[PDB]
């Protein structure tokens, strides 16, 4: 017996400082939300990071947390996801669905200057990749979980051309989980066998 | 390609077009 | 002091090696399955495949691929059972079960695919809790491990294996039975 | 911008040594007790005795045995008090209290069993928030530590002791005052930069 | 003491479940 | 001092003062 239900929250965001989890996981219910570095504790549309505390927080993270400002705005219109840079400092996003959409290396990191926006995710694109992946085996489908996960950095970029080579080296970074695509992946994973 | 899987993915593609 | 029946009869916490991974899952329905798939919004499924761990290594990455349908837990009456839906055996360490058969609290039980086991019994716990008020605070305080149960999905630990601690297994969880815990609190507060 | 009064006036996070243990506890009632017992479904009790830590050592296990009735926190009017219900003294590090008496920000106050102390005062914080907009973003941004309060249940830390950091104490918690945090948010957004 | 009565009540409650 | 910021804090002081 298999039963499925539409998720209440279309995504969940986890905040990270260096390689450590800081704060609780935030689940976005509204189609629009802002991830800022301020201190509002009771806003279902704002993921205020300024109030999260880390006893092992160093100096450079403290300085980086001051430049988040208005942070990033995420909206989910139709079947596509966008990230808008409201911060006075550029943000760096690593979205496999976006990277593949343009024929870039999977680890590619996109810089979003203040005021600009970008098509972070596309449901139709993912559905197409999920279809042509059942022909490559369990491994290919299992690794499609990273397609549902997206990582962003608030001030400092990482990857090639930079000194930080991994996202765990950036002072302030988050990781999104797209519940919609994740549920579609579950339907296909069960049928893939071992 | 597992036959049950390809049909499951085929339904997913139909859903995405409805959203568009 | 005022007491209320807990909304969730149990809470499960997922672990990878010696590090917590994901949030704590609170089961509201009497039946739930802990699998390694990716459904995020099923009140009856604790899908571990969607949980991410920046500190996940290779061996854990391989172990997470064989979880499959995982384990299904049902709460019939006043007893708890674990059924092995995975095509790989699971390893359970339940003091309530170990004592029911007189085994060491650290004993680890292997559940082959398709098999099941009576993980917990409230009546048994209540009896141990009764004859424990005569042994002192320490004995009653140590009855919290009776309310906690640990499972391993592919690799076993403890005696009979090379892994000696539950923190050595790649993928393991830890259950907390809210019901039994509330009974323990009633006796602990008055024990002084 | 839209604002709503927070449902929970504070949130407490339990810690053992340098590792987070258990979920964050959100206080809805104006009075709550953080004890070492095992009730999981009491909106007025943050029972730490049921929280498990696989990496818990001996000294932490011994410290968890002396928590007992723990600490009682009530939020009467616009002030916060901590009462030591445990048979062992508790150690609090409240910047609002430290500043109220002209002590170093890192100063740790010892509360013997049965005693209490005015941990926080809204009026004091509101006044400090006003005279802080004149020093720049940095000064206002650093008012987030004013909204965070740390307590230790048996062993003290800081100067005069061998433990120099709160991460060295076996059992300690960290409070977040949502009320003061919301006031800070209104001023931080308008400070720019 | 008084606690044993609370535990004695628990034993009656646990028997009720079946 | 920003005009909107000082006014927001100015309102906060009255709100906290009302509590007493």
Coordinates of C-alpha atoms in Angstrom, one line a residue:
Chain A
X1 CA 0.0 0.0 0.0
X2 CA 1.5 3.4 -1.1
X3 CA 0.0 6.7 -0.1
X4 CA 1.3 10.2 -0.9
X5 CA 0.3 13.7 0.3
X6 CA 1.2 17.2 -1.0
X7 CA 3.7 18.8 1.4
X8 CA 2.5 21.7 3.5
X9 CA 5.9 23.5 3.2
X10 CA 7.4 23.7 -0.2
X11 CA 11.0 23.9 1.1
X12 CA 13.1 23.8 4.2
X13 CA 16.3 25.9 4.8
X14 CA 19.1 24.9 7.1
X15 CA 21.6 27.6 8.2
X16 CA 25.3 26.7 8.5
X17 CA 28.4 28.5 9.8
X18 CA 31.6 26.9 8.4
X19 CA 30.9 23.1 8.7
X20 CA 28.5 23.3 11.7
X21 CA 24.7 23.4 11.9
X22 CA 23.5 26.6 13.6
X23 CA 19.8 27.0 14.6
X24 CA 16.8 24.9 13.8
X25 CA 15.6 24.0 10.3
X26 CA 13.1 26.5 8.9
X27 CA 10.2 25.3 6.7
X28 CA 8.8 27.8 4.3
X29 CA 5.0 27.7 3.9
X30 CA 4.4 30.9 2.0
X31 CA 5.5 31.3 -1.7
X32 CA 7.7 34.2 -0.7
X33 CA 10.3 34.4 2.1
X34 CA 13.4 36.4 3.0
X35 CA 16.5 35.0 4.7
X36 CA 18.1 38.0 6.4
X37 CA 20.6 38.6 9.2
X38 CA 18.2 40.4 11.5
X39 CA 16.6 39.3 14.8
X40 CA 12.8 38.8 14.3
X41 CA 11.8 35.5 15.9
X42 CA 8.2 35.3 14.9
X43 CA 7.9 35.9 11.2
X44 CA 6.8 32.9 9.1
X45 CA 8.2 34.8 6.0
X46 CA 11.6 35.7 7.5
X47 CA 14.6 33.4 8.4
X48 CA 16.4 35.9 10.7
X49 CA 19.9 34.6 11.2
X50 CA 21.2 37.5 13.3
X51 CA 19.6 35.9 16.4
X52 CA 21.2 32.5 16.0
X53 CA 24.1 32.1 18.4
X54 CA 27.3 29.9 18.0
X55 CA 29.6 29.6 21.0
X56 CA 32.4 28.5 18.5
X57 CA 31.8 31.5 16.3
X58 CA 35.1 33.2 15.3
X59 CA 35.8 36.8 14.3
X60 CA 35.5 36.4 10.5
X61 CA 32.1 34.8 10.8
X62 CA 31.0 37.7 13.1
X63 CA 32.1 40.2 10.5
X64 CA 30.5 38.2 7.7
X65 CA 27.2 38.0 9.6
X66 CA 27.0 41.8 9.7
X67 CA 26.9 42.1 5.9
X68 CA 24.0 39.8 5.3
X69 CA 21.6 42.7 5.8
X70 CA 18.3 42.0 3.9
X71 CA 19.9 38.8 2.7
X72 CA 18.2 36.8 -0.1
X73 CA 14.5 36.7 -1.2
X74 CA 13.2 33.4 -2.5
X75 CA 9.9 33.1 -4.4
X76 CA 8.2 30.0 -5.9
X77 CA 6.1 31.1 -8.8
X78 CA 4.4 28.3 -10.6
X79 CA 7.0 25.5 -11.0
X80 CA 10.2 27.6 -10.8
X81 CA 12.3 29.0 -8.0
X82 CA 14.2 32.3 -8.0
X83 CA 16.7 33.9 -5.6
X84 CA 17.0 37.7 -5.4
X85 CA 20.0 39.4 -3.8
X86 CA 18.6 41.9 -1.4
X87 CA 21.9 42.1 0.5
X88 CA 24.4 44.9 -0.1
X89 CA 26.9 42.1 -0.7
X90 CA 26.7 39.6 -3.5
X91 CA 25.5 36.0 -2.9
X92 CA 26.9 32.8 -4.4
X93 CA 24.5 30.0 -5.3
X94 CA 25.3 26.4 -6.3
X95 CA 22.2 24.9 -7.8
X96 CA 22.7 21.7 -9.9
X97 CA 19.4 22.1 -11.7
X98 CA 20.6 25.6 -12.8
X99 CA 24.2 24.5 -13.5
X100 CA 23.0 21.6 -15.7
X101 CA 20.5 23.9 -17.4
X102 CA 23.4 25.9 -18.9
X103 CA 25.9 23.1 -19.4
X104 CA 28.2 24.1 -16.6
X105 CA 30.3 21.9 -14.3
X106 CA 28.1 20.5 -11.4
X107 CA 30.3 22.3 -8.8
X108 CA 29.9 25.6 -10.6
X109 CA 29.1 28.6 -8.3
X110 CA 27.0 31.5 -9.6
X111 CA 27.5 35.0 -8.3
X112 CA 24.3 37.1 -7.8
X113 CA 25.1 40.8 -7.4
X114 CA 22.8 43.0 -5.3
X115 CA 19.4 43.6 -6.9
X116 CA 19.7 40.8 -9.5
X117 CA 17.8 37.6 -9.6
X118 CA 18.2 34.1 -11.1
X119 CA 16.1 31.1 -12.0
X120 CA 17.3 28.8 -9.2
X121 CA 15.1 25.8 -10.1
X122 CA 12.7 24.5 -12.7
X123 CA 10.3 21.7 -12.0
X124 CA 9.9 20.7 -15.7
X125 CA 13.7 20.5 -16.2
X126 CA 14.1 18.2 -13.1
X127 CA 11.2 16.0 -14.2
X128 CA 12.8 15.5 -17.6
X129 CA 16.2 14.7 -16.0
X130 CA 14.4 12.3 -13.6
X131 CA 12.8 10.5 -16.6
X132 CA 16.0 10.0 -18.6
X133 CA 17.8 8.8 -15.4
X134 CA 15.9 5.6 -14.7
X135 CA 17.8 4.2 -17.7
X136 CA 21.2 4.7 -16.0
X137 CA 20.6 2.6 -12.9
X138 CA 20.1 3.0 -9.1
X139 CA 23.3 5.1 -8.7
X140 CA 22.1 7.9 -11.1
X141 CA 18.7 8.1 -9.5
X142 CA 20.0 8.0 -5.9
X143 CA 22.4 10.9 -6.7
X144 CA 19.4 13.0 -7.9
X145 CA 18.9 14.1 -4.3
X146 CA 21.5 16.8 -4.7
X147 CA 19.3 18.1 -7.5
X148 CA 16.7 18.9 -4.8
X149 CA 19.4 20.6 -2.6
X150 CA 20.7 24.1 -3.3
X151 CA 23.5 25.9 -1.4
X152 CA 24.1 29.6 -1.1
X153 CA 26.8 31.8 0.4
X154 CA 26.0 35.3 1.7
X155 CA 29.2 37.3 1.3
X156 CA 32.2 35.1 0.4
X157 CA 32.3 32.9 -2.7
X158 CA 33.9 29.5 -3.0
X159 CA 35.0 27.0 -5.7
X160 CA 37.4 27.6 -8.6
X161 CA 38.9 31.1 -9.1
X162 CA 38.6 31.5 -5.3
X163 CA 40.6 30.3 -2.3
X164 CA 37.7 28.6 -0.6
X165 CA 37.3 25.3 -2.4
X166 CA 34.3 23.9 -0.4
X167 CA 31.1 25.4 0.8
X168 CA 32.0 24.4 4.3
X169 CA 34.8 27.0 4.2
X170 CA 32.4 30.0 3.7
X171 CA 31.4 31.9 6.9
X172 CA 27.6 32.0 6.4
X173 CA 25.9 29.5 4.1
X174 CA 22.5 27.7 3.9
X175 CA 21.1 24.6 2.1
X176 CA 17.6 24.4 0.7
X177 CA 15.5 21.3 0.3
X178 CA 12.8 21.4 -2.3
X179 CA 10.0 19.2 -0.9
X180 CA 8.0 19.1 -4.2
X181 CA 10.8 17.6 -6.3
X182 CA 11.8 15.4 -3.3
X183 CA 8.4 13.7 -3.3
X184 CA 8.6 13.0 -7.0
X185 CA 12.0 11.5 -6.4
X186 CA 10.6 9.1 -3.8
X187 CA 8.1 7.7 -6.2
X188 CA 10.9 6.8 -8.7
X189 CA 13.4 5.6 -6.1
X190 CA 11.2 2.8 -4.7
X191 CA 10.8 1.3 -8.2
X192 CA 14.5 1.3 -8.9
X193 CA 15.1 -1.7 -6.7
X194 CA 18.6 -2.1 -5.2
Chain B
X1 CA 15.2 0.8 -17.1
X2 CA 12.7 -0.7 -14.6
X3 CA 9.3 -0.7 -16.4
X4 CA 7.5 0.4 -13.2
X5 CA 10.0 3.3 -12.7
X6 CA 9.7 4.7 -16.2
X7 CA 5.9 4.9 -15.9
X8 CA 6.2 6.6 -12.5
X9 CA 8.6 9.2 -14.0
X10 CA 6.2 9.5 -17.0
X11 CA 3.4 10.6 -14.6
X12 CA 5.8 13.1 -13.0
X13 CA 6.4 14.7 -16.4
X14 CA 2.7 15.0 -17.0
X15 CA 2.4 16.8 -13.6
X16 CA 5.1 19.4 -14.5
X17 CA 3.3 20.4 -17.7
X18 CA 0.1 21.0 -15.8
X19 CA 2.0 23.5 -13.6
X20 CA 3.3 25.3 -16.7
Chain C
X1 CA 2.6 19.6 39.1
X2 CA 0.1 18.9 36.3
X3 CA 0.4 16.1 33.8
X4 CA -1.0 15.6 30.3
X5 CA -1.1 12.7 27.9
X6 CA 1.7 13.2 25.3
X7 CA 0.5 14.0 21.8
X8 CA 3.3 11.9 20.3
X9 CA 3.8 8.4 21.7
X10 CA 7.5 8.3 20.6
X11 CA 10.2 10.4 19.0
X12 CA 13.0 9.1 16.8
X13 CA 16.4 10.7 16.3
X14 CA 18.7 9.7 13.4
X15 CA 22.4 9.4 13.8
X16 CA 25.4 8.9 11.4
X17 CA 28.5 7.6 13.1
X18 CA 28.9 9.9 16.2
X19 CA 27.0 12.9 14.7
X20 CA 23.3 13.8 14.8
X21 CA 21.8 14.1 11.3
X22 CA 18.4 15.8 10.6
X23 CA 15.7 16.9 13.0
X24 CA 13.9 14.7 15.6
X25 CA 10.8 13.0 14.2
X26 CA 7.7 12.8 16.4
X27 CA 5.3 10.0 15.5
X28 CA 1.6 10.8 16.1
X29 CA 0.0 7.8 14.4
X30 CA 0.4 4.3 16.0
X31 CA 2.3 3.1 12.9
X32 CA 5.3 4.6 11.1
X33 CA 8.1 3.4 8.8
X34 CA 11.7 4.7 8.9
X35 CA 13.1 4.2 5.4
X36 CA 15.9 5.6 3.3
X37 CA 13.8 7.3 0.7
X38 CA 13.0 11.0 0.1
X39 CA 9.4 11.8 1.0
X40 CA 9.4 14.9 3.2
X41 CA 5.7 15.2 4.1
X42 CA 4.5 11.8 5.4
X43 CA 3.5 11.6 9.0
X44 CA 4.0 7.9 8.8
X45 CA 7.4 7.8 7.1
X46 CA 10.7 9.0 8.5
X47 CA 12.6 9.3 5.2
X48 CA 16.3 9.4 5.9
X49 CA 17.4 9.5 2.3
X50 CA 16.6 13.2 2.1
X51 CA 18.6 14.1 5.2
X52 CA 21.9 15.7 4.2
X53 CA 25.2 15.5 6.2
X54 CA 28.2 17.6 5.1
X55 CA 30.3 15.2 7.2
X56 CA 29.0 12.1 5.4
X57 CA 31.8 9.8 4.3
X58 CA 32.1 7.0 1.7
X59 CA 31.2 4.0 3.9
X60 CA 28.1 5.8 5.2
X61 CA 27.2 6.8 1.7
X62 CA 27.2 3.1 0.7
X63 CA 25.2 2.1 3.8
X64 CA 22.5 4.6 3.2
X65 CA 21.8 3.0 -0.2
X66 CA 20.8 -0.4 1.3
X67 CA 18.3 1.0 3.8
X68 CA 15.4 0.6 1.3
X69 CA 12.0 0.3 2.9
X70 CA 13.8 0.3 6.3
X71 CA 11.8 -0.7 9.4
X72 CA 8.1 -0.4 10.2
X73 CA 7.0 0.3 13.8
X74 CA 3.5 -0.3 15.1
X75 CA 2.0 0.4 18.5
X76 CA -0.7 -2.2 19.1
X77 CA -2.2 -2.0 22.6
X78 CA 0.7 -1.5 25.0
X79 CA 3.5 -3.1 23.0
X80 CA 5.9 -2.0 20.3
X81 CA 7.1 -4.1 17.4
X82 CA 9.8 -3.6 14.7
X83 CA 9.4 -5.3 11.3
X84 CA 12.3 -5.5 8.9
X85 CA 11.1 -4.2 5.6
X86 CA 14.6 -3.8 4.3
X87 CA 16.3 -6.5 2.2
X88 CA 19.2 -6.2 4.7
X89 CA 19.0 -7.2 8.4
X90 CA 18.6 -4.6 11.2
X91 CA 20.2 -4.6 14.6
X92 CA 18.2 -3.6 17.7
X93 CA 19.4 -2.9 21.2
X94 CA 16.3 -2.7 23.5
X95 CA 16.8 -3.2 27.3
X96 CA 13.1 -3.9 27.8
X97 CA 13.4 -6.8 25.3
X98 CA 16.8 -7.9 26.5
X99 CA 15.5 -8.1 30.1
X100 CA 12.3 -9.9 28.9
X101 CA 14.6 -12.7 27.8
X102 CA 17.3 -12.0 30.4
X103 CA 20.0 -10.6 28.2
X104 CA 22.6 -8.0 28.9
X105 CA 21.3 -4.4 28.4
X106 CA 23.9 -3.9 25.7
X107 CA 22.8 -7.0 23.8
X108 CA 22.1 -6.3 20.1
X109 CA 19.4 -8.3 18.4
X110 CA 19.5 -9.0 14.6
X111 CA 16.3 -8.9 12.7
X112 CA 16.6 -10.6 9.3
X113 CA 14.4 -9.3 6.4
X114 CA 10.8 -10.1 6.8
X115 CA 11.0 -10.9 10.5
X116 CA 9.5 -9.0 13.4
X117 CA 10.1 -8.7 17.2
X118 CA 8.2 -7.4 20.2
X119 CA 10.5 -4.5 21.0
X120 CA 8.7 -3.1 24.1
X121 CA 6.1 -4.0 26.7
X122 CA 4.6 -1.5 29.0
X123 CA 3.4 -4.0 31.6
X124 CA 7.0 -5.4 31.8
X125 CA 8.4 -1.9 32.3
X126 CA 5.7 -1.0 34.9
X127 CA 6.7 -4.1 36.9
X128 CA 10.4 -3.2 36.8
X129 CA 9.5 0.4 37.8
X130 CA 7.5 -0.9 40.8
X131 CA 10.2 -3.1 42.3
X132 CA 12.8 -0.3 41.7
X133 CA 11.5 2.3 44.2
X134 CA 13.1 -0.1 46.8
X135 CA 16.6 0.2 45.3
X136 CA 17.1 3.9 45.6
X137 CA 17.3 7.0 43.4
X138 CA 20.2 5.6 41.3
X139 CA 18.2 2.5 40.2
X140 CA 15.2 4.6 39.3
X141 CA 17.3 7.2 37.6
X142 CA 18.9 4.5 35.5
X143 CA 15.5 3.4 34.2
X144 CA 15.7 6.0 31.5
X145 CA 17.7 3.6 29.3
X146 CA 14.8 1.2 29.5
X147 CA 12.8 3.9 27.6
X148 CA 15.4 4.3 24.9
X149 CA 15.9 1.9 22.0
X150 CA 18.6 1.9 19.3
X151 CA 18.6 0.3 15.9
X152 CA 21.2 -0.2 13.2
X153 CA 20.2 -0.6 9.5
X154 CA 23.0 -2.6 7.9
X155 CA 26.0 -2.9 10.1
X156 CA 25.8 -4.4 13.6
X157 CA 27.8 -3.4 16.6
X158 CA 28.7 -4.6 20.1
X159 CA 29.8 -8.1 20.9
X160 CA 29.9 -10.7 18.0
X161 CA 31.0 -7.8 15.7
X162 CA 34.1 -5.6 15.3
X163 CA 32.2 -2.4 16.0
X164 CA 31.9 -2.2 19.8
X165 CA 29.8 1.0 20.1
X166 CA 26.6 2.1 18.5
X167 CA 28.5 5.3 17.4
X168 CA 30.6 3.0 15.1
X169 CA 27.7 2.0 12.8
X170 CA 27.2 4.1 9.7
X171 CA 23.4 4.5 10.0
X172 CA 21.5 4.2 13.3
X173 CA 18.6 5.8 15.1
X174 CA 17.5 6.3 18.7
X175 CA 13.9 6.0 19.9
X176 CA 12.4 7.8 22.9
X177 CA 9.1 6.4 24.2
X178 CA 7.1 9.4 25.6
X179 CA 4.5 7.2 27.3
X180 CA 6.9 5.2 29.5
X181 CA 9.0 8.3 30.2
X182 CA 5.9 10.1 31.7
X183 CA 5.4 7.2 34.1
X184 CA 9.1 7.4 35.2
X185 CA 8.7 11.1 35.8
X186 CA 5.7 10.6 38.1
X187 CA 7.8 8.3 40.4
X188 CA 11.1 10.3 40.1
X189 CA 9.7 13.6 41.3
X190 CA 8.3 12.0 44.5
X191 CA 11.4 9.9 45.1
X192 CA 13.2 13.0 46.4
Chain D
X1 CA 6.9 44.7 6.7
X2 CA 4.6 42.8 9.0
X3 CA 5.0 42.1 12.7
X4 CA 3.3 39.8 15.2
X5 CA 3.8 39.4 18.9
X6 CA 5.8 36.2 19.4
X7 CA 3.9 33.2 20.8
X8 CA 6.9 32.2 23.0
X9 CA 8.6 34.9 25.1
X10 CA 11.9 33.0 25.2
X11 CA 13.6 29.8 23.9
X12 CA 16.1 27.7 25.8
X13 CA 18.8 25.5 24.2
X14 CA 20.4 22.7 26.3
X15 CA 24.1 22.1 25.9
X16 CA 26.5 19.5 27.2
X17 CA 30.2 20.5 27.0
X18 CA 30.6 21.8 23.4
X19 CA 27.7 19.9 21.8
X20 CA 24.0 20.7 21.4
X21 CA 21.8 18.1 23.1
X22 CA 18.0 17.9 22.5
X23 CA 15.6 20.2 20.7
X24 CA 15.1 23.9 21.5
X25 CA 12.4 24.5 24.1
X26 CA 9.9 27.3 23.6
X27 CA 8.3 28.7 26.7
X28 CA 4.6 29.8 26.3
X29 CA 3.6 30.3 29.9
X30 CA 5.1 33.1 32.0
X31 CA 6.6 30.5 34.3
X32 CA 8.7 27.4 33.6
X33 CA 11.1 25.1 35.3
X34 CA 14.2 23.5 33.7
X35 CA 14.8 20.3 35.8
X36 CA 16.6 17.0 35.3
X37 CA 13.5 14.8 35.3
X38 CA 11.8 12.9 32.5
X39 CA 8.5 14.5 31.6
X40 CA 8.3 15.0 27.8
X41 CA 4.9 16.7 27.4
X42 CA 4.8 19.6 29.9
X43 CA 4.6 23.1 28.4
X44 CA 6.0 24.4 31.8
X45 CA 8.9 21.9 32.2
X46 CA 12.0 21.5 30.2
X47 CA 13.0 18.0 31.5
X48 CA 16.7 17.4 30.6
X49 CA 16.9 13.9 32.3
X50 CA 15.4 12.3 29.2
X51 CA 17.8 13.8 26.7
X52 CA 20.5 11.4 25.6
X53 CA 24.0 12.0 24.4
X54 CA 26.0 9.1 23.1
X55 CA 29.2 11.1 23.6
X56 CA 28.4 11.9 27.3
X57 CA 31.4 11.2 29.6
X58 CA 31.5 10.4 33.3
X59 CA 31.7 13.9 34.8
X60 CA 28.7 15.1 32.7
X61 CA 26.7 12.1 33.9
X62 CA 27.5 12.9 37.5
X63 CA 26.6 16.6 37.0
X64 CA 23.2 15.5 35.5
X65 CA 22.5 13.7 38.7
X66 CA 22.7 16.9 40.8
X67 CA 20.3 19.0 38.7
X68 CA 17.2 17.9 40.7
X69 CA 14.5 20.6 40.5
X70 CA 16.8 22.7 38.4
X71 CA 16.0 26.4 37.9
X72 CA 12.7 28.3 37.8
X73 CA 12.2 31.2 35.3
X74 CA 9.3 33.6 35.6
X75 CA 8.5 36.6 33.4
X76 CA 6.6 39.1 35.6
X77 CA 5.9 42.4 33.9
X78 CA 9.0 43.4 32.1
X79 CA 11.7 41.6 34.1
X80 CA 13.2 38.1 34.1
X81 CA 14.2 36.2 37.2
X82 CA 16.1 33.0 37.8
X83 CA 15.5 31.0 41.0
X84 CA 17.8 28.1 42.0
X85 CA 15.5 25.2 42.9
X86 CA 18.4 22.8 42.6
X87 CA 20.3 21.7 45.7
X88 CA 23.5 22.9 43.9
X89 CA 24.1 26.5 43.0
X90 CA 23.7 27.8 39.5
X91 CA 25.9 30.2 37.5
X92 CA 24.3 32.8 35.3
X93 CA 26.0 35.1 32.7
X94 CA 23.5 37.8 31.8
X95 CA 24.9 40.9 30.0
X96 CA 21.8 42.9 31.0
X97 CA 22.5 42.1 34.7
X98 CA 26.2 42.5 34.4
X99 CA 25.8 46.0 32.9
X100 CA 23.1 46.8 35.5
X101 CA 25.7 46.5 38.2
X102 CA 28.8 47.7 36.3
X103 CA 30.5 44.3 35.9
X104 CA 32.5 42.9 33.1
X105 CA 30.3 41.6 30.3
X106 CA 31.7 38.1 30.8
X107 CA 31.2 38.1 34.5
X108 CA 29.4 35.0 35.9
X109 CA 27.1 35.3 38.9
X110 CA 26.6 32.5 41.4
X111 CA 23.1 31.8 42.6
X112 CA 23.1 29.6 45.7
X113 CA 20.1 27.2 46.3
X114 CA 17.0 29.1 47.2
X115 CA 18.3 32.5 46.1
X116 CA 17.1 34.4 43.0
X117 CA 18.4 37.3 40.8
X118 CA 16.9 39.8 38.4
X119 CA 18.4 38.3 35.2
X120 CA 16.8 40.8 32.7
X121 CA 14.9 44.1 32.6
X122 CA 13.0 45.2 29.5
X123 CA 13.1 48.9 30.4
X124 CA 16.9 48.8 30.9
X125 CA 17.3 47.1 27.5
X126 CA 15.0 49.6 25.7
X127 CA 17.0 52.5 27.1
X128 CA 20.3 50.9 26.0
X129 CA 18.8 50.3 22.5
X130 CA 17.9 54.0 22.2
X131 CA 21.3 55.4 23.1
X132 CA 22.9 52.9 20.7
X133 CA 21.7 54.3 17.4
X134 CA 24.3 57.0 17.8
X135 CA 27.3 54.7 17.7
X136 CA 26.6 52.9 14.4
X137 CA 25.5 49.6 13.1
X138 CA 28.2 47.7 15.0
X139 CA 27.0 48.9 18.4
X140 CA 23.4 48.1 17.6
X141 CA 24.3 44.7 16.0
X142 CA 26.2 43.7 19.1
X143 CA 23.0 44.1 21.2
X144 CA 22.1 40.6 20.2
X145 CA 24.2 39.2 23.0
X146 CA 22.1 41.3 25.3
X147 CA 19.2 39.1 24.2
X148 CA 21.1 35.8 25.0
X149 CA 21.6 34.5 28.5
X150 CA 23.8 31.5 29.6
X151 CA 23.4 29.5 32.8
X152 CA 25.4 26.6 34.3
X153 CA 23.8 24.1 36.7
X154 CA 26.6 22.9 39.0
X155 CA 30.1 24.0 37.8
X156 CA 31.1 27.6 37.2
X157 CA 33.3 29.0 34.5
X158 CA 35.2 32.1 33.7
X159 CA 37.7 33.9 35.9
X160 CA 38.5 32.6 39.4
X161 CA 37.8 29.0 38.2
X162 CA 39.8 26.6 36.0
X163 CA 37.0 26.4 33.4
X164 CA 37.4 29.6 31.2
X165 CA 34.6 29.0 28.7
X166 CA 31.0 28.0 29.0
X167 CA 31.7 25.1 26.7
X168 CA 33.8 23.5 29.5
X169 CA 30.8 23.1 31.9
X170 CA 29.1 19.7 31.9
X171 CA 25.5 21.0 31.8
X172 CA 24.6 24.5 30.6
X173 CA 21.8 26.2 28.7
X174 CA 21.4 29.3 26.6
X175 CA 18.3 31.6 26.6
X176 CA 17.0 33.7 23.8
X177 CA 14.6 36.5 24.7
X178 CA 12.2 36.8 21.7
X179 CA 10.7 40.1 23.0
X180 CA 13.9 42.0 23.2
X181 CA 15.0 40.4 19.9
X182 CA 11.9 41.7 18.1
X183 CA 12.6 45.3 19.4
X184 CA 16.1 45.0 18.1
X185 CA 14.8 43.8 14.7
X186 CA 12.8 47.0 14.3
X187 CA 15.8 49.2 14.9
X188 CA 18.4 47.1 13.0
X189 CA 16.4 47.1 9.7
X190 CA 16.4 50.9 9.7
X191 CA 20.1 51.3 10.5
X192 CA 21.2 50.5 7.0
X193 CA 24.5 49.0 6.0
Chain E
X1 CA 6.7 6.3 50.5
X2 CA 4.2 8.4 48.6
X3 CA 6.0 7.7 45.3
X4 CA 5.2 3.9 45.5
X5 CA 1.5 4.7 45.4
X6 CA 2.1 6.6 42.2
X7 CA 4.0 3.6 40.7
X8 CA 1.3 1.3 42.1
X9 CA -1.3 3.4 40.2
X10 CA 0.9 3.1 37.0
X11 CA 0.8 -0.7 37.3
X12 CA -3.0 -0.7 37.4
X13 CA -3.1 1.7 34.4
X14 CA -0.6 -0.5 32.4
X15 CA -2.8 -3.6 33.1
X16 CA -5.8 -1.7 31.8
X17 CA -4.3 -1.4 28.3
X18 CA -4.9 -5.0 27.4
Chain F
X1 CA 21.4 58.4 14.0
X2 CA 18.8 57.4 11.3
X3 CA 15.4 59.3 11.6
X4 CA 13.3 56.1 11.2
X5 CA 15.6 54.1 13.5
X6 CA 15.5 56.6 16.4
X7 CA 11.7 56.8 16.1
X8 CA 11.3 53.0 16.2
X9 CA 13.5 52.8 19.3
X10 CA 11.6 55.9 20.7
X11 CA 8.4 53.8 20.3
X12 CA 10.0 50.8 22.0
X13 CA 10.9 52.9 25.1
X14 CA 7.2 53.8 25.5
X15 CA 6.1 50.2 25.1
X16 CA 8.5 49.0 27.7
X17 CA 7.6 51.9 30.0
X18 CA 3.9 51.0 29.7
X19 CA 4.8 47.6 31.1
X20 CA 5.8 49.2 34.4

